[PDB]
Structure formats: structure tokens, C-alpha cells
């Protein structure tokens, strides 16, 4: 503990790692009734804290070891941290990573002038190749977490926090992979200000520290979740567990959806993007505040990293959206005797139908206080519309949203037209009103989840002898449109 | 020009605005063969440059004008800029915004101690209410762009850039709403280093400066696109146009999709998210580099803001996917046989499948809507299609079929042709290349699949629904068979949403 | 004006020059009834502003001009400015300076890797050697002031001041050598905030700008004073005068003594030592405040440099003492009696005695040259003189007698009138008010004091020499008597310096 | 030790104290053959380090204690440190100081809004009055050094140094008054990097720590020197000695003249002025380098303060000048048969004479290598001038310099004239040549110790019947002059 603090105070991290802000999360603080502070380790040059530990380790090596070079086995944040650390020291770095590793992560490593050697289908094979090269070539292995110099480097995070928040500080929430970050933080905190709680946060699918603490030994998880890839570690480090077992107060676990909501919360207060591992701490805070009914506390989260691919953000946003209970999903039957009048100028997210008595799959923005869906449903029913409320129906939201269509047995004369219109309050209903009922609508699809342009496809029953009227009629509507009647995608599936 | 530069040099912006980095965009620079630099105005305390101009305007007001307070009409960046500016000066601020305005933006304004007045269904009504309150209450209106003190404040952006990049600098690309930002930048640049090009960038749907410059007067656009909401301005400012008409070299317009791709490019190099208006400049750079076949130039983009709702990233990502055309979409015909759907899934191999959708139509044949990630070099679409065809699968390539990607993706399903033995089951499994095929392997072939929906767009947990033809006298086997798979599952046969639509 | 401002805004000074504080001078402000602010150019790495202009000039040179290197002729601030500038640019620098130049300044130049060439007995010969080497070797000469790029570099001082003090600022006071500093400041100030007065300050002995402005041409002064060595320039620069003639409001001249008092004032408020040139501005402020009876103004002084040899502080302190007139000088007549000298020392009391000197002239009467610290409020000179007279001492007040302070202070002594029994003893004791009288008490009255010298100008250890009339037959008593005093002492009776002069 | 380090790491000093540069002393390093670094505590807002300890102490007080106010007994750096500390906390401060205290120091305290109560002829009486007010009024006494919170505050100096100089560091040299500064530094250094020597430096006249360490107890010095007023402390603190006795490696003592030379050295490298206490460390370094023949070491000095009155600098410069051996002092006899020709254009500092065979007291700039005085003396003697070399003659330099004059028994017709001329190589000799020998010079005084104007007084033997010629003759010389023949200062003494 003393030994670790001395190493923290004499670390070399500031050759390349930077001091990061400890920022208030204003809206999250208001919601929770506690002062929430975000430690912005995402603002390190490699977009995670790992530059601290990797650099501190590399910098402590002998002139001889540095001459031979360093090696690691990693496809991720450690790889980048070590690569930059090596470049800063002017030494050669070899990073071994699985052949399956995505090309964008490979290039990120090579961008710092490290050699990325592609070997193995998974981490264990990569690791074994690296360890072989240690003996063959005399490279010094640099472990992602299980190394005293690494731990001490990560501990500089706590050194900063305690300097930045010298007053009240109830608890620090730390994501836990192999335990380097939390061990370094716990060492420093429990030495200087032991009244502060050090709380680990792990995914349900990767709770190696929580399980180890419960079992009192270093259990090996049967597998780890892929979502929180920053903390995909099956077994707690040895050097890290030796600190954690006594100096971490507890580990809270959180789910994928909790992580997704935390990513959005952080974005809403800071405009910064965290990777799943980087949002664990805020997710832990939210779960802790509810479990303890905490009020008036000062709670710190380590925003540990931001290395999440753009394509993952779509899914993150989809999952965080579910929490918000804005989107009502309702199935509306239209008698053969408006509807849009009752729904008004509300934001439509889904408006899907296919002739089989007429049923429409409707998604519509609502608000729990300002525009509750229950009143709208009752309103529509009282107007004589059969309505099913599918807002809590998982199949509806996950699947049926994408399944209204199919072939219709007895639609002849179906022609298919795609249209585009500028999005505006009432635009869809205005489109349908201008489209009119000169021909029967036998199919409709329309989705709007933050879309710029309104995009709709409609099937119309147009008798052969009225088809000459199509150009004129549709042009009169005033929107760009395309005749998709001969589109093979339409023919095969619809 | 001189007048504006003197105002820029004596501005008060640094009471609350900060100096922002001018950052290399490394991967974009390598791709383009030009040094691209990003001016990070997203790192202002209100996540856009507008704190500069709003503060400088407020700070130049007389004690008299300050007395009752300041007012604006804005649902976005200007609202926040002005609210913080007013808090810093210790003055009252009222911000008028439409009733429809999202709660998150309302609260952001109130958080700085400003009064948020909710009035109107659209901006023009909010604006009129604000302007009325000017006369009623004696508040001083603070314009988002059309004010010399605002222009001078925004011009501090150029003052920083020229200090930060004293060497080669070919062109600065600036998003243009009402022209405050670009007018301030143009004033300073054309004064000090006129060899630098000042290039405005506007959306195709909101090109009020480009149209004004072409017409030589301040035309009013018949409407503005709402995608790039930060620059949704129908008419160029008067004070701004007086500068721009002579000192902006040109305006390049870009599409929504180009903006979306620029948002991703910026993210890939910096991890920052720009709002659409904030990505215009990089979109302009990409269009300019191609138009000029530029090489070895130094090109600066103003990343003007980051105030985009998180949920809008879904659409942004969908559009940036289109182009690159990594996602193949194919229609595959198979015979209606117990194991054909599975066998075809096997042929696709260990790839990121994005869509795998089917619904029984006749006994003659079945069609599967398939989405698959591909890579032009590493795993080309064309070779995969040929590979599948050579295995005896009819395949239509629908990758460039807009209807397929926009609509049919969400329309494979519909009602069972006949009454039959369909039971419906939802399942979840860890998402991973090969997980779908592994699921179908574990599910086995006791029962015909009559319906399937599966989408995977960056998902963590794989989700499928399957319709299975389970004869009444085999239904006793269902719990044990499905539990043996080892995944969470739900019997949705009686789900009313299934009954009504499918 | 515009041309110069553009050069200032694009200068390269911040590669090595730093932003300096603009600091309140609290005690000076209270005394003067105006807010005085000190621009701390002494805090540059070379202890003067000249790093700005020298670096900006060097940085604007062509690769060709840089190739063989740069040269200057300077024994002071410019030498150091240029040497550091050249080191920063990675170029060769040669500095020519007179053979007589002090070793400390030579080494300072060499420390930055510049060649110091020692040539000439005075500056003009050094200058000519440098200019010759320009042609011989192809070095580019770097002028201390008369160069547009130098002027623009110095002008960054004004750019900082106007940013640091955006509110009220009545006047900026600038030392003037050849006019680089003031021209750069005037250019920027008269462009941006022309309501601010730009006031040059020169020594009476070196008023080349003041004379040039009065004559409307670049007069050559017949000689320059060497006290304020930083501004020892006979003729205003050409490029500098082109700006100054229209854009400097006036030049105030100050004396050496005024400069010395300003050096102390600055020290008292900041603990910094300015060289004479560096204190001109504050001296100008004091003269201006009195001339205008200014009240409530904000007045800025450029503390331009700190490169004064430590030993010159002796003279500076001596001159700053004169005025204030705290040191009383009096001539006191006493009878020639065993105990009169001591009794008179007693009457002076526990005060800081600065001088207490006497040498026997006749048996009729003795005269003592006395210096004593006084205070106008706390311990007034006039009351002390009256106090001593009222005790029956003839006293002449020589406080305003220049001969007394400059010369007689060092001339009380000379040869014994007759041969006698004079022995001479030097003593040391801890300096403290009353220590002298305590020494004379301990020395006692066995022997007549026939000579005494004692000076105390901030001394730590008190030092006295006394001549004592010790009859041959009492000399055995000397060791024990003097040891009993308890202080170090030395018998100097056989000291050849004593024999020859006294 | 651990306890002190925890207090150092959690101190409150940075509310008002600043981080100070650790600056290379380039020319001193070259001379000594060691890397010398100066810790610039003179750049604190009160021009000494004492703001650190005083603030840290005050800030730790209870709300109640702060409400009542703080008191100290000090006329010096502590007074200013405490006054500013109190102002920063918005609390009342009373500083008791002797009635004899100089008015400029009293006003410095009042400038920070502290009440300065004038009581006692010396410190002990001031202290007793303060301690009485503690009981009467409930003020919290703030000790200049002997307080754990004060020690911890001063220790932040070491925290900075070890961060600023993470590589080689052989020894840190610290001025010692009551031992707060050195105790705090020693605590931190011996904890983190015990290989670094911690060396105290005291004046010969105030060596309370050195004596205490030698005696193994807290000896009381019989008196303290006044010159190094910052460290005028007769007895080492209790809390400070408890650290120092084990954790300070040694104390070096230095003299007044050594201190004066160090003040100049620091000025020559930094242009900063240290007070005597503030220059002790550099003086210690110089003495250590010679004693150890140190080479290639890294040696740090605490430049602890700059609160020395302007008037003291004259004396400091006079004493530091003596070290330089530039000024030759010679007594030259002028036969009744040049001289100035032999001396050439050298810088004259003294040129004094009064008729009694003719002897001149001459001060002249020389250089040990470039222009040695021995060669000049031999040169002058070989030209037939009796010369005494008085350069090493203390009476000559301290006293006779100011004593050449007196009455002359048989000078009648003496008239006295003061002149001024611009200083220039050869100016004095040029003046004397132009003054000529129309009348005999019977007296001369001239000193030049960095003077701007040449100032001389001359006695001339002018017969009554030639006095009409005086205005014309002297005006022809071309310098301003004044007839001082009737000046009573001349009459009485000369």
C-alpha cells in the first residue's frame, strides 16, 4: 500500500499521459439528487486511461530491455496505449493480435509505428505466440493490468481525483477488467482517504472481480460478454486481486441496457462518447443511488475509454431509446365507414399496413406527463377504433415492426410507388390526404426514427384502364416518386 | 474590414469562451492526400461556437440595455450560448422556444438560470413572441447572427486559427446558417492573410448564402431542410451578407448523406460527435478535394457544434452505411424443404449477417431476404454472390436496390397463406459471427420453419423470431427441445400482435 | 499603421518570448492617487523585451540570409536577445562587443552558443567590425531597433497590454533608445485605441526622440549619457521616427536621480530590480502625475529590462537616498576633553548613525562629522538638531550641503597636527542602534580619542577605527583593556597606510 | 513520516500559494562543475514560502476557531504569510509585533487587512502579549514553524521539487530558522527518495539546528545574528527537531560575506534578489562543492525569500564586491620632477590627496588574468614611483578610503572648487590635464563606484592677486563647477 503509493508518486506517466478533467454531470446530478463527477480518461491521447500504466511500465525498463523492445498481446485499448508508449520512448513495439482482429484496430496500432503481428483465432493463441517471442527475441512483455508498475500508473487517476475534489467525496466507481485500474485507485484512496468507498463496476456477463471477492479466490469465468469488450477478462489478475480483496468495498454489476443508457447520459451532459466499458461507472452510480436511496452524496465515475466503433452507436441508441418510453406502438383497425384527425400533428415513427379488415401498425411519439399514450388510446377507442396497445409488447417492437407486408392473396391491379417528402408536423397525414382515395391503398410502409426525408412506399389498386392517369395524378401531389411495380424485390417478397 | 478587425481584437469573448484546439484529422488526411485540420468549436462550454458571439454582443450592451435583461428565440445553440453569456454577466435572460421543443434542451437553458418560455408550434411564432416581449418588457433582443458585435465575436475563431496555423493554409471551410460565423472569419482572414480561401458550406436544402451570392441580393428560400438544424435559415443576414458578398470565395453545397459520412469521419479521427451543421465543413472539404483533385493542401474545417440528440445517431449511421456499400442485400431462392433454410445459412458462413428474413408463401419455393457485411478488398460482395450461385443458389443482388434497403427490409412477413400448425417463438443468443447458424444447428430440423425475422445492426444480443410448423401431436416435445438449445425463449403463439398482423 | 499591425498580428515572437504580467504597483499607486501598472518585460528569458524584436527579425529572414548566420554589435540586451533568438532558430550568431566589455556579459552570450568577438575600445569600433564582417563573411546584420520586423516584434508588448487592460487606460509610458519599442507600441495603440496616450521617456542626457520631434528631423545628439546604458542612442532610427513623429504624443525627460528613485519604487512594490533604462517609464509617470496633477488615471509603465550589474546598485541606492533626505548630516563642535566625544554620542541616542568621524586638529575644540537617519513624521531632522543645540551643542546642519554629502564624508582625517602618543585600533561589533555608544562605553575613557572613523550604510557588522593617545608608560594596559571590550580588534599603529596618510 | 506525507498530499496550500519554478543557475553551474537548481519560493505572493505553512494551518481550523480569528507574533515573513492567508479565508488576523518594528513592515501587514498591534521592545514581549490575547479573546495562535500543519504546508516545496526533478538529485539545501521548512522537506524526501541528502544551511551567528543536532537536544543560543533576519531563531522547534534529528543529514554554516556573495550569484543567474535567509542555500552549495570537490552532481537550493529592504542592497553589493578582487588600492608617491600615462585608460575608483611629499590614495580596476595589479605596481615602480600595494590592507579599504584630507598646516591661498564631468575612459586624467598646473593642487577627492557623473573637489593655491583669473580659467576647462571656498563644511574639517 505504502509501496504502491510511493510508486504512484514517482510514476513517469506525465511524459505522455495528461491530467484529465473531473467534470460535473449536471443533468444526471439533478435527476439523481447527488453530485456526480465524471473523470474524463477518454481525453487521453489513446482515448483510454491505458496509456498511463503501459507508459509507466515501459519507462521503468532497463536500457538493455528497451534496446530489445517490448511486446504485448492485445487487440484493444492496451495495444494502443503500449504502442504510443513505445513510440514516446523511441523503442520498438510488437503487438500480437488474433488473425480475426478487425482491420481498423490493426491500423490504429500501426499508426503509432508498432508492428502488429496477426496470429491466432482468439486471444490465448495470440498470447502464447507473444510469450514465445519473449524467449526467442528477448522482448519484454507488457501486461495490460497484472504488473505493479502498470497498477501504479493507473493509480495516478486517483492521485488526480483526490487533488481535484479535496472536499466531500463519498465513493469512486471504477470499471473492472483484470483490475489494474481499480487496484491502483484503491491503493491510493485507501492510503490517503480511506473514508472514500471504492466501488468496482462490472457487466453481468463479465464479473470476474465480483465472483473472486465472493469466493475469496481468483475464479475463472466460463465465458465473458462481448458487448463490454474493454473488460472482457475471465480471471482477475494476481497482483490486482491482492489489493482488491481488501481495498475494494464491493463490485456492482450492470446489464447491457443499463450500459447503453449510461452512454447516453454521459453524452447528454458532456457530448462525449464512451465505449461500453467506459460507461460502466455511471451505470453503477445509477444502480447504487437507487439501491441506497442516496441523497446529497458526491459520487465519481471513471469514464475510462471512448474506443467504440461508430456502427455500434446505432445499437446503443436503439437500446437507450427503449428506456425513454416515448414511442407508443398501437395496432389500429380502420372500419369501412379521420383517424389522422384524432392522432393530430404527433410525430409518427411507424405507419405500416398491408391488405388482408384493415389493420395499421402505428408508432407515435408520446410523453408520460405531457401526452400519455393511455389517454390517446382511450380517445381513439371512444371514436370507434379498435386499438391494441403494443407498447410493452416485445415481439411488436423487436420484430413485427419489420414484418408487416407479405403477399396478399386477392390484390390484383396492385402498382407500387415510392415517395419522398420533407419531414414536418403533419407531413405524413398531409401526404396521405393529397394521395387521396382515387385508388385504394393496398399497402403502406413508413418509418421515421430521426429521419431527414419522409420515405414511404404505397401499393395502389389501379385498374389497367386507369393507368394512363398515373403520371398526372401522382405529379399533382407534388412529391418525387418512383414506379416500383416491376422492382424484383417487390415481386418476390410482396 | 478594418472596423471588424478592430472589434475582433477588442472582443470580450474570453470571459467565458475558450481557445479551442486545431486538431489533425489523421485518417481523413491520409485518405484525401491533404492535411485536414479540425477547429474544435464543439469543445466550447455550450458545445458550439455561439458562446463567442452571444457573449460579445451582451458584453457590449449599455447598462441601460442590460437593466431589464436580454431575450432570444432559439431551440438550440444560440439559446445555450446566450443563456450562459447572460449568467456570466449576471443579467436576466429569457429564451423563447416552441411548445414542441424537447425537454432536454429546455432544461439545458434553465440550468444556466435563464427563463425558458414555451410558445408556438414553430420557430416563427416563438420569434414573434420574443420580439413582442422586447417592447412589452424592455428586454434587449440578441440576434443569433445578424449583429456586428456577434460577427466580431465569431471572428475570434479566425484569430485563433491564424495564430495556430501560421504556415501553409490553403482554405478554411465554414458552415453557413445566417452568416455570422463565416462573416467574422472572412473579415479577419481577408484582412490579414487574403491568400487563404474562405469557403462557405451549406446543405443543398438550405443554401441561403450560395443563392444570395449568385443573385447578388438577399433571396428568401421557399423552405429550408430541417436535417442540418443548426443552419436552418431562409435568408442571409444583412450585416453578414455585406461582408460575405465580397469576402467569401464561394459556397459549396452538400447532401444529407454527405453530412452523415462527415459525422462518421470526424468521429473516426477524434471520437467527437458533431451535429449535422458541425460536420458541413468536412463534407465541403471532401467535395472540394475531389472537384479540384487537390493534393498537398492544408484545409481547415470548423467543427462548429455537437448539439445533436443522441437518438439521431441511428439515422446518421444508417445513411453513412449507404455509400461504402459494405452491406450486401441479396434475395435467395431455396426449395421448400425441412433443412434448406439452415443449409443456406451454412453457405453464408461465419460473417456478420445483418438481415435473414423469410415467410412461407407457397410449397413451390421460398425466398430469403439476406443482409451480409462485405468488404471491397477483404470479402467482396461480387465474389460472395458468385460463390453462392456456384453452390446452386439463385441469388438476386439487391445491394443497389433502394426499395430493398429502405422498405423491403421491413416488409418480409405478412399473413400465413393458409391455416396450419404455426407456433411462434422468440429467442435471444450472444451476437457473434456464426451465432445464427449455431442457433439453427441447435434448433435442429424436427419442424419446418415457416417464418423468420432476424436483424443485426451492431447488436450485442442476437434476437430472432421463428414460426415453426408443429403438429398438435408433437407439441409435447417443444419445452424440452427449446430448453435444450440453452437460450432464453418465449412462446409468442398467442401474442395478439402476431395474430393480427401475421 | 495597418501594415505594422498586420505584421504584429503575424509575428513569430512566441516561439521563445513569453507573455509577461501587467502588475499593480500598490504602494506607488497609493502615493500617486492613480492606478499604476507595470509591464514586466524583465521577466523575458533574457531579462529584457529585446527577445521579441530580435526573434521576429531573425524568423522573417530568408533561408539564404540565415545560411551563413546573423551578426550584431551589442554589449548588452540586444546581444542576449539575438543570441537566444539564433539558438532557437538553430542558426549561427556572432556578437561583436568592445574589448572592455565585462566578462559576465561576454559569457552570457557564449552560453547561448553565440560567438562573442571582442573588438574595439568603444561601441562604434565594434559596430564597424560587425558591419565589415557582414560583407566579408555574408552574415546578415540584425539591428537593435531600426527594422520593420524588429518594430513589429516589440509591438507585441502593446498587443498584450491592451488585452490585459481592456478597460480604462489613460497612458502608456515607454523608454526610448532608438525607438523600436515605442514605435511598435505606438503603431498598435494608435490603430486600436487611439484615445490612449503613448508617452516616451528618455534621460535628460539621451533625449534623441524628444529632440527629433521638436526639430522635425532626426538630429544627432553631440553625446549621450552612459548611466541609462540601455537607451544610449545619439540618433532616432529612421523606420522608428517615421512612426513616432505622428503617433507618439510626447517625450518626457527625467534625471539620473529620478531614475534611481524609480528603481527603488519598483523594487519596493515588486522585488524586481530594473536597469536604469527599465525604470525610465515609472520615472516618467511620477513626473507626469505631478505636472498634470493627475488623479484616478490608469497609467502603464514598461519595465523594459533588468540587466544592470549588481555593483551599480551601490550608486543607485546612494542617489535614491538623496531626496527623501532621511539622512541628516551635521557638524557638531565639542570641547577637547577626555569624555566629550562619548557624551555627544550619548546625546544622539539609539538611532541609526551613518557617519561619526573626527580627527584632532587643536586643543581649543573638536568637530564631529555626524550622519543620522531621520524621518519627517517619526523622528524629524529639525527637532533633533534643536534637541542637540538645546543641550548646549553647536550644530551646523549640512543635510542640504552637497560638498558635505559627496566629499567631506570621505575627507575627515588627515595628518596629526603634532607628534604625539597616537596608537590606532580597528574594531568590529554587531551593528544595531546604540551599538556605537555601547562600544564607546565599553572602551571607556583612559585614553583620549584623537581620531575616529565610522560609517554605517546598511552594514551588518559595525566597523570603527580609533586613534587613542596612549602614553608609553600606559601601553602595557592595552591588550587587557581592549580584550575586555569583547570584540575583535587589530592594532594598526604600524599599518603603512595609516603612517603615510594619517 | 507517513503521517506527514499524508498531510502534505492533502494540504490546502494551492488556494493561494503557487507552484514555483525550479530554475537552472547557468553561470553558477559552470563555475562549480555541478548542476545547480534554484527553487524560486521568492515568487510566492508574499515573496517567501511562508504562505504555504501559514495557509495550511489556518485552513485546517474549525469554523468556530475561524470565526474568532487568528493571531501571531512576528514582524517578518510569517506575519505577511499569515496576513494573506487570513485574508484569503475571509477571517480576522491580529499580528503582534514590537513597538520598535520598522514602519514599512507594519504597513505590509496592514496592506493585507490584518490588525498590526505594536507591543514590546523585542519579540518575547510581543509573543507574551499575543499568548495573552489567545486566552482573552479566543484567537487561534499560528506558529511560524512549530506546528504539524505548518510543517506539512512547507513540505509541499519538496513535493514540487521531486516532481520537477525526477532524475538525478544528489542533495537539497534548505535554510533553517526554527526548522519548519527543512522538517517538511526532510519528511517528504526521506519518505519518497531517501537517497537524496537533505542539508540544512544556517548562518554562523544563528546555528540553532546545527548545535541541537550536535548536542542531541534543543539548545538555546545565547544570541542570534541580525543580518540573516529570516532565520533569527535561538532554539529549534520541538515538532521540527523531532523530524530533523533523524532525517536531516547535516547542517552547513556560512558567514555574512558568503551570504552576500550568494545573493549576487543568484542575481547574476536569475535577476532575482534574495534576502540573506533566502541566499543561505546557495552559499551552502558553494561551501559543499569545495569541501567535497563535488563534480557532476545535481544540487538544489531553496531560494526561500526576497524580503530585504533596498537600503541593505548597497551593503550586500559592497561586501560581494570584495570577493571579486577587481579593485587595486595603491599609495603612490609623486616626485617633484605622467603617472596617468602609466595607469592609462583604466577605470579609477579612488583618487584622493591632501598636501602635507605628495601621496595619492588610488583605486583602480584590474583583472587577475587580463590586467593583474602586480604587473602594474612593478611597472609604476620601475618608472620611479614609490608605490605601496594596499589591496589586501583592510584598514585602507574600510577606513583610509574615507580619511584622506584633514587640515594642512601651511596651505595658505587655498581655494576649493567642486566639478562634475561625464564619466568616460580617461575622463579623470583628461580633467586633471585640462585643469592644468597654473595653480598648485593642494587637495583632491574623487570616488567612482558605479557613478554616472564624475564628481571631484579640488583645492588650488591661488594667490590673492590672481583670483580675478579664476572664472575665465575654470570656465575654459568646460565643466560645471562651484566655488566652495566659503563652504562651512570645508572650513571646519579641511
Automatic annotation (TrEMBL), chains B, C:
Keywords: Amino-acid biosynthesis, Branched-chain amino acid biosynthesis, Isoleucine biosynthesis, Lyase, Pyridoxal phosphate, Repeat. Pathway: Amino-acid biosynthesis; L-isoleucine biosynthesis; 2-oxobutanoate from L-threonine: step 1/1. Residues 328-400, 423-494 form the ACT-like domain. Signal peptide: none annotated. InterPro entries: ACT-like_dom_sf, Ser/Thr_Dehydratase, Ser/Thr_deHydtase_PyrdxlP-BS, TD_ACT-like, TD_ACT-like_sf, Thr_deHydtase_biosynth, TrpB-like_PALP, TrpB-like_PALP_sf. Belongs to the serine/threonine dehydratase family. This is L-threonine dehydratase. The lineage of its organism: Bacteria, Pseudomonadati, Pseudomonadota, Gammaproteobacteria, Pseudomonadales.
Amino acid at each position: 500500500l505504502e509501496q504502491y503509493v510511493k510508486k504512484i508518486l514517482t510514476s513517469r506517466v506525465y511524459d505522455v499521459a495528461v491530467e484529465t478533467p473531473l467534470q460535473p454531470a449536471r443533468q444526471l446530478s439533478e435527476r439523481l439528487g447527488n453530485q456526480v463527477l465524471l473523470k474524463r480518461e477518454d481525453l487521453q491521447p489513446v482515448f483510454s486511461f491505458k496509456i498511463r500504466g503501459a507508459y509507466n511500465k515501459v519507462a521503468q525498463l532497463t536500457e538493455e530491455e528497451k534496446a530489445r523492445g517490448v511486446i504485448a498481446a492485445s487487440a484493444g485499448n492496451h495495444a494502443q496505449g503500449l504502442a504510443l508508449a513505445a513510440k514516446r520512448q523511441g523503442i520498438r513495439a510488437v503487438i500480437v493480435m488474433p488473425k480475426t482482429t478487425p482491420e481498423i484496430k490493426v491500423q490504429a496500432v500501426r499508426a503509432h509505428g508498432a508492428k502488429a503481428v496477426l496470429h491466432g483465432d482468439a486471444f490465448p493463441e495470440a498470447l502464447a505466440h507473444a510469450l514465445k517471442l519473449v524467449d526467442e527475441k528477448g522482448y519484454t512483455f507488457v501486461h495490460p493490468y497484472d504488473d505493479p508498475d502498470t497498477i501504479a500508473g493507473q493509480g495516478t487517476v486517483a492521485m488526480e481525483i483526490l487533488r481535484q475534489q479535496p472536499g466531500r467525496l463519498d465513493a469512486i466507481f471504477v470499471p473492472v477488467g483484470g483490475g489494474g485500474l481499480v487496484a491502483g485507485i484503491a491503493a491510493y484512496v485507501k492510503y490517503l482517504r480511506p473514508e472514500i468507498k471504492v466501488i468496482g463496476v462490472e457487466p453481468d456477463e463479465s464479473n470476474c472481480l465480483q465472483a473472486a471477492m465472493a469466493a475469496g479466490e481468483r475464479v475463472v469465468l466460463g465465458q465473458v460478454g462481448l458487448f463490454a469488450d474493454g473488460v472482457a477478462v475471465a480471471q482477475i489478475g494476481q497482483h490486482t486481486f491482492d489489493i482488491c480483496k481488501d481495498h475494494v468495498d464491493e463490485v456492482i454489476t450492470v446489464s447491457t441496457d443499463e450500459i447503453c443508457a449510461a452512454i447516453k447520459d454521459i453524452y447528454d451532459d458532456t457530448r462525449s462518447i464512451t465505449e461500453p466499458a467506459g460507461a460502466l461507472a455511471v451505470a453503477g452510480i445509477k444502480k447504487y443511488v437507487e439501491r441506497e436511496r442516496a441523497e446529497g452524496q458526491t459520487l465519481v465515475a471513471i469514464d475510462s475509454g471512448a474506443n467504440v466503433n461508430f456502427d455500434r452507436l446505432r445499437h446503443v441508441a436503439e437500446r437507450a431509446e427503449l428506456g425513454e418510453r416515448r414511442e407508443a406502438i398501437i395496432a389500429v383497425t380502420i372500419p369501412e365507414r379521420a383517424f389522422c384527425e384524432a392522432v393530430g400533428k404527433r410525430q409518427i415513427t411507424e405507419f405500416n399496413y398491408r391488405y388482408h379488415e384493415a389493420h395499421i401498425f402505428v408508432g407515435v411519439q408520446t410523453h408520460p406527463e405531457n401526452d400519455p399514450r393511455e389517454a390517446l388510446v382511450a380517445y381513439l377507442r371512444e371514436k370507434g377504433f379498435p386499438v391494441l396497445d403494443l407498447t410493452d409488447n416485445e415481439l411488436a417492437k423487436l420484430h413485427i415492426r419489420h414484418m408487416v407486408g407479405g403477399h396478399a392473396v386477392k390484390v390484383s391491379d396492385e402498382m407500387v410507388f415510392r415517395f419522398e417528402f420533407p419531414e414536418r408536423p403533419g407531413a405524413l397525414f398531409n401526404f396521405l390526404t393529397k394521395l387521396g382515395g382515387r385508388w385504394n391503398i393496398s399497402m403502406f410502409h413508413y418509418r421515421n426514427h430521426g429521419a431527414a426525408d419522409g420515405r414511404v412506399v404505397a401499393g395502389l389498386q389501379v385498374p389497367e384502364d386507369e393507368r394512363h392517369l398515373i403520371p398526372q395524378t401522382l405529379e399533382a401531389i407534388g412529391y418525387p416518386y418512383w414506379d416500383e411495380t416491376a422492382n424484383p424485390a417487390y415481386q418476390l417478397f410482396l
